[PDB]
Amino acid sequence: ADLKSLAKRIYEAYLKNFNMNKVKARVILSGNPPFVIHDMETLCMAEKTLVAKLVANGIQNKEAEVRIFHCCQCTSVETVTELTEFAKAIPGFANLDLNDQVTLLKYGVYEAIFAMLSSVMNKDGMLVAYGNGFITREFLKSLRKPFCDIMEPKFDFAMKFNALELDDSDISLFVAAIICCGDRPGLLNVGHIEKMQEGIVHVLRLHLQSNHPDDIFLFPKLLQKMADLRQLVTEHAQLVQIIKKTESDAALHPLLQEIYRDMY
């Protein structure tokens, strides 16, 4: 009935459940300041401070590229936990069957992750380790294949996404819409999910109209970004499969393995 109140509920749930938001990220990115990781020396320095356990194995430590990939996985795993609690604020989600809830999150989490990753990215690098590290885009590109191909497509998406100049009130509803997709494979009650999707997308459309009167096409632009994210995730899963088969040391967190299993 009152779509403005619903938009605010989602926004407040977004601020409460995600450790990073765009406002907090910009404060850090503008200038315990973040340690800058721009080469192997500064990577090893940062690890010894921020993730000492990971490099406390002496000569048995993993290769630098594998340690980085492992840190990315940890971030993903944490964002999954945050996304699962955020989903409860979406009208109708908690009323869905448990199996449908799992399915929606299975296919949505990485689309949501790459969307929200844009908030901690600029053209030179990205915030990591809960805002305490900044790793340069060029360093990540300098890694040996195939690890240098992980983040660059995400930077490419983020640069265009950030040019839309969304704020957290927009992003929170966008992430909600990502989760409420009625065309996910294997859904039980597609009808109820489609109605849930229609409701949240209705809220998103009205919010964008009020919050961005200067950009009349912003809503269709974001619909297209949702399609772009789906393709970005499919391509990411393909890369993860190559790493799994060709990099014996690059262990995949079990929760993420289940997410990728039978996805695409």
Ligand SMILES: CCCCCC#CCC#CCC#CCC#CCCCC(=O)O
């Ligand atoms: C001392 C800390 C050093 C940080 C090193 C670093 C780094 C780079 C980074 C980072 C943040 C992130 C993320 C989510 C993701 C993803 C896709 C890949 C994983 C997955 O497939 O889940």
